Amino acid sequence: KVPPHSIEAEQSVLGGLMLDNERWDDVAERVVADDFYTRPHRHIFTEMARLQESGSPIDLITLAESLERQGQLDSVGGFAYLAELSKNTPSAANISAYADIVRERAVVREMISVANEIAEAGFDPQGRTSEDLLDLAESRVFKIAESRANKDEGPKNIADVLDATVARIEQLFQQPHDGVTGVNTGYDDLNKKTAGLQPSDLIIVAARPSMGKTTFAMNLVENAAMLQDKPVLIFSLEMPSEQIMMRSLASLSRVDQTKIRTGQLDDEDWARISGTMGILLEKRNIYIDDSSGLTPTEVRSRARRIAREHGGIGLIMIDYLQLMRVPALSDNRTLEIAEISRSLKALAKELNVPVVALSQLNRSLEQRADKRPVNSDLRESGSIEQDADLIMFIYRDEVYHENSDLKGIAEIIIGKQRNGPIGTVRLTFNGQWSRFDNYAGPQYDDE
Amino acid sequence: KVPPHSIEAEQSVLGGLMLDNERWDDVAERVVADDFYTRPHRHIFTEMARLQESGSPIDLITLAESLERQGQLDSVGGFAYLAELSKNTPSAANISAYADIVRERAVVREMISVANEIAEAGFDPQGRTSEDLLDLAESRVFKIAESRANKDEGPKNIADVLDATVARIEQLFQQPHDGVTGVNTGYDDLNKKTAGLQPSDLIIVAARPSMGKTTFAMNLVENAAMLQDKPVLIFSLEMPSEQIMMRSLASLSRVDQTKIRTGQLDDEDWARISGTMGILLEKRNIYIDDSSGLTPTEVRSRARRIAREHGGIGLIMIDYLQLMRVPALSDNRTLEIAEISRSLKALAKELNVPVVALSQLNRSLEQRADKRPVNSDLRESGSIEQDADLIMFIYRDEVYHENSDLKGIAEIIIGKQRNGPIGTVRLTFNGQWSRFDNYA
Amino acid sequence: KVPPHSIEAEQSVLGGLMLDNERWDDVAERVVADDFYTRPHRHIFTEMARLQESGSPIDLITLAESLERQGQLDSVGGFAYLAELSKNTPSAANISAYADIVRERAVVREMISVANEIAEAGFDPQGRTSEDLLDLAESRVFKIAESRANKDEGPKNIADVLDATVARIEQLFQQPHDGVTGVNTGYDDLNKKTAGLQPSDLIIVAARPSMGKTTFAMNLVENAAMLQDKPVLIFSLEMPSEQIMMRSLASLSRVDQTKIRTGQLDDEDWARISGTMGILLEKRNIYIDDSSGLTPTEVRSRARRIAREHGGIGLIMIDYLQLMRVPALSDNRTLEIAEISRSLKALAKELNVPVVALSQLNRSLEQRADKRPVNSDLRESGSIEQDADLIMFIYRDEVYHENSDLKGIAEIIIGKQRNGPIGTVRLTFNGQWSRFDNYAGPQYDDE
Amino acid sequence: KVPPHSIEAEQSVLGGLMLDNERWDDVAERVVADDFYTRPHRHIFTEMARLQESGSPIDLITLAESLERQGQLDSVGGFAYLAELSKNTPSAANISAYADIVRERAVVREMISVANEIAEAGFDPQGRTSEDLLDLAESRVFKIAESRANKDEGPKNIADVLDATVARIEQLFQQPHDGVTGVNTGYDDLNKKTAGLQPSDLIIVAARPSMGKTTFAMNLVENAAMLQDKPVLIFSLEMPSEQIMMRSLASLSRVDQTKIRTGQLDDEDWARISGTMGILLEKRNIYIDDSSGLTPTEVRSRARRIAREHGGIGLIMIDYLQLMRVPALSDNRTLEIAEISRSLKALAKELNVPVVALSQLNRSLEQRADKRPVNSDLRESGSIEQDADLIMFIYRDEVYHENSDLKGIAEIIIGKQRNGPIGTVRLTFNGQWSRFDNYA
DNA sequence: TTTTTTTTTT
Numbered sequence A, C: 001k002v003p004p005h006s007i008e009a010e011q012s013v014l015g016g017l018m019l020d021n022e023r024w025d026d027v028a029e030r031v032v033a034d035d036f037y038t039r040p041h042r043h044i045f046t047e048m049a050r051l052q053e054s055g056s057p058i059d060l061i062t063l064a065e066s067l068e069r070q071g072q073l074d075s076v077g078g079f080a081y082l083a084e085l086s087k088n089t090p091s092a093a094n095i096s097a098y099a100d101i102v103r104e105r106a107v108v109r110e111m112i113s114v115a116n117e118i119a120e121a122g123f124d125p126q127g128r129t130s131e132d133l134l135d136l137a138e139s140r141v142f143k144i145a146e147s148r149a150n151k152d153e154g155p156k157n158i159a160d161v162l163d164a165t166v167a168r169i170e171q172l173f174q175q176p177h178d179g180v181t182g183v184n185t186g187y188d189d190l191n192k193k194t195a196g197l198q199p200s201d202l203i204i205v206a207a208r209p210s211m212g213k214t215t216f217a218m219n220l221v222e223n224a225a226m227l228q229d230k231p232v233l234i235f236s237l238e239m240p241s242e243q244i245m246m247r248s249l250a251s252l253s254r255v256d257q258t259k260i261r262t263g264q265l266d267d268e269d270w271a272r273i274s275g276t277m278g279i280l281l282e283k284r285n286i287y288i289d290d291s292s293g294l295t296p297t298e299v300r301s302r303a304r305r306i307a308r309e310h311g312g313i314g315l316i317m318i319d320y321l322q323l324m325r326v327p328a329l330s331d332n333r334t335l336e337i338a339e340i341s342r343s344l345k346a347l348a349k350e351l352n353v354p355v356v357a358l359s360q361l362n363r364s365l366e367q368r369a370d371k372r373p374v375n376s377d378l379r380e381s382g383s384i385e386q387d388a389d390l391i392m393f394i395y396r397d398e399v400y401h402e403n404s405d406l407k408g409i410a411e412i413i414i415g416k417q418r419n420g421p422i423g424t425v426r427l428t429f430n431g432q433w434s435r436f437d438n439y440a441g442p443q444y445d446d447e
Numbered sequence B, D: 001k002v003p004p005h006s007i008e009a010e011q012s013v014l015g016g017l018m019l020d021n022e023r024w025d026d027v028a029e030r031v032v033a034d035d036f037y038t039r040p041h042r043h044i045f046t047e048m049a050r051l052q053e054s055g056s057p058i059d060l061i062t063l064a065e066s067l068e069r070q071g072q073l074d075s076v077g078g079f080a081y082l083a084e085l086s087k088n089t090p091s092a093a094n095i096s097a098y099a100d101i102v103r104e105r106a107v108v109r110e111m112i113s114v115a116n117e118i119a120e121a122g123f124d125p126q127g128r129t130s131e132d133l134l135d136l137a138e139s140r141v142f143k144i145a146e147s148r149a150n151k152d153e154g155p156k157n158i159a160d161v162l163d164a165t166v167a168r169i170e171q172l173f174q175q176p177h178d179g180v181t182g183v184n185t186g187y188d189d190l191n192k193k194t195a196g197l198q199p200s201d202l203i204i205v206a207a208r209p210s211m212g213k214t215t216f217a218m219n220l221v222e223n224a225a226m227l228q229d230k231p232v233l234i235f236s237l238e239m240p241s242e243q244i245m246m247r248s249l250a251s252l253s254r255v256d257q258t259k260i261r262t263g264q265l266d267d268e269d270w271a272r273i274s275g276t277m278g279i280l281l282e283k284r285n286i287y288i289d290d291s292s293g294l295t296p297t298e299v300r301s302r303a304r305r306i307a308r309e310h311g312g313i314g315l316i317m318i319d320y321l322q323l324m325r326v327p328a329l330s331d332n333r334t335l336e337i338a339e340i341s342r343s344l345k346a347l348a349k350e351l352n353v354p355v356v357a358l359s360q361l362n363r364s365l366e367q368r369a370d371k372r373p374v375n376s377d378l379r380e381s382g383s384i385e386q387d388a389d390l391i392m393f394i395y396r397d398e399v400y401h402e403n404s405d406l407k408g409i410a411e412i413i414i415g416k417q418r419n420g421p422i423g424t425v426r427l428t429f430n431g432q433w434s435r436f437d438n439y440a
Numbered sequence E: 001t002t003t004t005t006t007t008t009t010t
Ligand SMILES: Nc1ncnc2c1ncn2[C@@H]1O[C@H](COP(=O)(O)OP(=O)(O)NP(=O)(O)O)[C@@H](O)[C@H]1O
Pocket: A207, A208, A209, A210, A211, A212, A213, A214, A215, A216, A238, A256, A257, A258, A259, A320, A431, A432, A433, A434, B385, B386, B417, B418, B419, B420, B421, B422
């Protein structure tokens, strides 16, 4: 058969090197002359490397002279072939991608050649035992993996991790500057464990229905918007934006939401709401999309659109994940949830922004005597625990027990925190204003 | 005939995508791969989408390589075809218009195909009745409408929401509704917490059997009909309309239901019932559908019919959700529950009408020592808690405990209330009259 | 293609109208002249409508004269064609079904024509937008539905229900009753609360094993048979019919069942049994089927057969519901029970007959200290509670407690009564005679 | 090409099975029906297996009758072919060697087929990445190696048990190991009782994560590394590399972890950290490879991979053993933990490494009245009470009791210990630096 | 996912 190769990518790389010499470093880091399929291409890249190591700039005339001095001008195709290669390449903007393609082709060809050698050894043992052939095959595959050892790698070795250790110590010397390392949550206790909303983090705040989960998420959004100027993006899939705005005005102005909903408001609270609206129009960093049944592709497109138009996005609010709908994986809810979580994590890593993705719980919580939520108590759990890093659960024993002494005290229990120890953050909930504040009472030592 | 297509617009879109990658978002929002008439164009757009999702820029060489890796380079026409497509397109200034034309052609061809399928079903009944074919055609046309309704989406600025909110607040402040924002329940305490039956709300009042749940729902219906002129629509799937009317007459005239059911009534109560009938004929806003095993689509069609004919609908009553039948998801009951709840919520949002749908409970409530209902006590809740916003539960400790001091006292406990606090409303129940009144 | 039409049905309708004029109203309500496929048939029906509106009877000669006066006799086919149409039709008994068929064909042809119009509009946009075409298609399909909406509808009016209710009230008030409006139970206290066995009611009397459950059901059956002449239908799923008849003779003649079982009976009780058999042969209204593992479809077919043969059914006795077998829902018992209960309630509403179906209880009742049955004690509860209306439970503290003073006293406690207050009716049970009788002892005040 | 096969050896094996039924066990252990090159030979061996499992002796006539009953007599070549096969074989003395040759041929053909599959995957990527192809090839070679396994169980003879027992007695008596026998644990009480970190052992410490258990395993890793240069491996599923590094620096340098995490600039702690990392660089055997969500078979494969890389594993640190949750067994964790423990013991015996795991217990450790880790506090008891060879339980009464009865005498209670006296091992812990010391 | 009903055991 024909070995898998991309001659066009090689020609594009050679033309870009003939035009641009600053991107030679990326090519040298990525590929070598052996990655070139044709032996003339290997000779051309070898001459280019020799000229660049000598400090000579990479152009057509000097390369032609260098090939003529070594006599390789006729071996590579002549000066007309080099001129054609220089002519064909428009630009070297995507020469890194071309080099990646060439490296992939070289890896596949090396794998095919190794497979041919292994099959030849299998057909003709030549006195080698089965264990000998197995070890030879393992060594060959490990050598193929070792060819990209600096590319495919994970945690580092002792010396390199010690250099990373001293570098991180020098970095964390600068850490006591504000205490909050990410987006400020507005809560002192929350900014101690989590140290604020870290970028590229999946924040899963899950609670029972009518537990203030949307309310606390809105409070977090308000605190972030007052503590930053980067625009936020809200996807209120469950509730309309009218109720969201009513909750925001009740929380910020500390006025009863019932009176706002009935509209029976005095002029003093009206002036407070007007001042809050003036502050919001000063900010104008909030964008709410109340459409329901949206795919993660649409959300990603809108997020990229806003980031392009408004210069990045401060916060992404999602109104609970089981409302999100994918037509492709609508057959199975768990597959749909896993796909949604994976796409949202990819988007969060893409734009480097903490995404507020709420979630619901299961009915096994009420079955348990202790109604403190766990990771397995999550509605369609599993992949959610895998993809997320900042999972939290709202607990209100006042709701479950009428005689509970934790009235107003809402406990945010961290289920998963990859970077930092988990814990229980107590907060003071005001149902009238729907306001979550820092718990100013006596601190409880978690047993 | 030749299907209506604009291949030149497709070529212009593909060439503009090859030239410009910044307007890729507009093309992705407008059209998909299936909108392309020719299958090679579908493959080309699929490869472009795969490359752009990976972050790779859209150029000729990378696209050709990507098609070569999957072996689809020869399927789409070869690299020369791609080079020709890149050469032909001058610019991508009007690529949005070309994509709109392509989407229009695709939707028109979809409509033509649906019409052909409808004609085929008409010529070949395959044992289906005319109603089945009509409902299938309605479903197909609704699907085509949903395919076009996705354009009206997009995040909005905070200022517009603020203006709408303050306008609504001023409207509520000017109107002296005296707390009751929605449809008046007829109960003062219920008009304090819920502030009346708000439009586009899914009200789930679930209770145990023989708890007056249907009776209390009928009392709510009577109160709404007396306190409004907008016509109501009743779907009495479980109980016959005759029993519903007897319960209504017993409740409104405050006469014993047993005496009315036996017919042993004096002429004074007869005159009271006659006056009640005169008031009802003065209103004539009540329409009861005692049919059972109904799909939500039939309910939606009848609701739209009555709303257009009678100028909107004040209230939509459902006689307990597990009686409803969906043949599509009849294999699993929870799928039926989720579909019914979603369809009812969508219908309530559509016609802006409060819908009161009853439900049943589970035996786990009986297992608990305290028999106060919770959200998990719902009979296959699932998305019931998520979609609904005005869930209430009826509690009568007099039934469970003979020595209970809550005789006549019915506790309507709000399981879920998104806007406002939840609580327990005490009411006075008259078994003889089957009358729910405010507790004193 | 050929449009879907039934010329034979049209010819049958025309011949029936030529023969029968009393069923013209059904045809006019069902179909119009436009529903006829062929234009001559439209002309014929138009002429028939014109003659009937004028009051002229619909016969061959007058119709021929009317067509001759308008000159349409040649257009419809001639007098010989009309004579052939009159000849071919045997009878007009099924002319309503024929008109329904013609209406169906007309609706299908209308749908096909509308689909053709929509396809033509799709092929030629004529400058219309896709929204315009969608609205036009919706309008056309809704016009088809509205043409099909000119029939019996679900929500009719409140006035019709009011008239039916007041007619029922007048019917019940003009008849002097003894507090019984349904089938008389034969027990005075039961006739106070339940007011007799009401038709279209699912009566569930459930108890423990033994406990005289089938015995009490048979006592109710005997009382109903003695107090009415409408035939009753028993499905003795559990017990053989021989033992059923032995228990019936023991209860009715007040003789010990054990002596009848042994056959050692005196001539006086023999004469009493002979007189009871003479009374039964005077009645001859009870029809018993002892077949087991029956589907509800077979039961419904047999019930319809008996009602057609013997002019309705007075009462339907079902001997214990878990004996009923459905092959389709044999996988899950609860689904099978729900389907059986739904089918039985549909049958009871269909024929307007009281159906007393027996059932069993759960062992959790024995787990409780107080062994008074509740709704949840029902075996495979839920749908049983929902579909039924007259649920009762048998309680015998004499069985549970040897020192109980309720010996002979059986408490029938109403668990569910949709219309009326529930209670506890105590009866006198005779184990020797196996006879349930009205309470001759002190009636205890229920708390 | 012609696949490498030895039909003559197959004929010899089949004829020997026809002659001798006593050596059927050797052939059944060695080869299967799939190892036969020709499908008729596979059918013949399948019929032989079916006859011998039924207890019927394997002869020509019964085999032919069974093949005729299944209709396979004509497919394999007829009765004359079977008679020829029986005639050809002289004896069954060397049938073991012939079966070994047949197994070798089958394994070589399997390797050739796998190589052909890999070459096909290389020629046709089908959208898969090169990493996917490499992982698939490694999986295929590992499957070949796993299929190249042999007998693992068997009732041992009394002589072998006596030899092992007397060897154990001589080890306990004659050897003057003076406490430590394997890798030095560091804790003096663990040095005496557990006799060091014995290679090919299963040491599972059952406690709460970030509650002294993580720093206990960290101190174990440190003490093991300070006395040997054998490459140790890190598999922490609880904390990242940076946080584990901070914990290790705080433990070794005796510096408060608040200063380690929150930067308190001073040169004394910096000098202690510099000395600690100098000692670590002197050891030069800490290879970080911590991840999450794995299985012990994957851990064994990575152990083989590291042995290919360097060779020899000093210690593997499994932090948060309850982070490998399989959703099938996530609810009842006992069976999953038992299977993980058995596979970890198999891995420990495989590469001679003292596999140490950090099992997570329940919240009842802080809730139950019995604050010590007993079956209620253990995760559904079961695999935490048994199975594991060294099940240590960290009764840190500091966390469980606010007024602790164990401050510096926190009990490392050993439920089961193969070598050493069980009991409550009271040890000192420094909460400031997260450092576990050794109480006398 | 949901939802019933049985034993065992802690
Ligand atoms: N005016 C008010 N007075 C008192 N409590 C109120 C008022 N308005 C709202 N609440 C409470 O605030 C909470 C509303 O929380 P909310 O965030 O809307 O629930 P939710 O988490 O979004 N529901 P879900 O999405 O199904 O989980 C409830 O506990 C209400 O009782």
